[PDB]
């Protein structure tokens, strides 16, 4: 379908673009065009409107935080994350296209494993226990907030999983 193609092309990585402007800028473009926001290291204010992204020095701005709320990001769009070195915070909220496979894909990016400190996943209806468990690879994670994830059926086992795998993790659960 047309809408399927559209979502796919919103997400697809253009490697030429990564070459031309660097990973952080290319990923900023992906996020904003898909209804997400980013905040750079060194900045208080967030980037929220695509057309207002900095023109700036080549590859100077580095993503520190991502807030994807009511966003169409999914699956291979996360390949934009591969070259990002400094991402510390990610919120996924009302991301209706995200699945366990998205979280798996994220969890396997070594660059994110090294940097990630805080994650929030809220009202993403497809996400299950499998996808949450994958996040244990984010070995430096200090805070994880899960809310309104109807696919997460075994919260107690998640609590115990993280207790051993990430003993210093602050886990906040707003789950039925
Ligand atoms: As955005 C975004 C792009 C395609 C389809 C749905 C949402
Ligand atoms: Mg948004």
UniProtKB/Swiss-Prot annotation:
One of its GO terms (molecular function) is metal ion binding. The keyword NADP does not apply. Mg(2+) binds at residues 35, 69. LRR repeats lie at residues 38-63, 64-92, 93-117, 118-149. InterPro entries: LRR_dom_sf. It is found in: Mitochondrion; Mitochondrion inner membrane. SUPFAM superfamilies: RNI-like. Gene3D superfamilies: Ribonuclease Inhibitor. Homotetramer. Associates with ATP synthase. Involved in regulation of mitochondrial membrane ATP synthase. Necessary for H(+) conduction of ATP synthase. Facilitates energy-driven catalysis of ATP synthesis by blocking a proton leak through an alternative proton exit pathway. This is ATP synthase subunit s, mitochondrial. It comes from Bos taurus (Bovine).
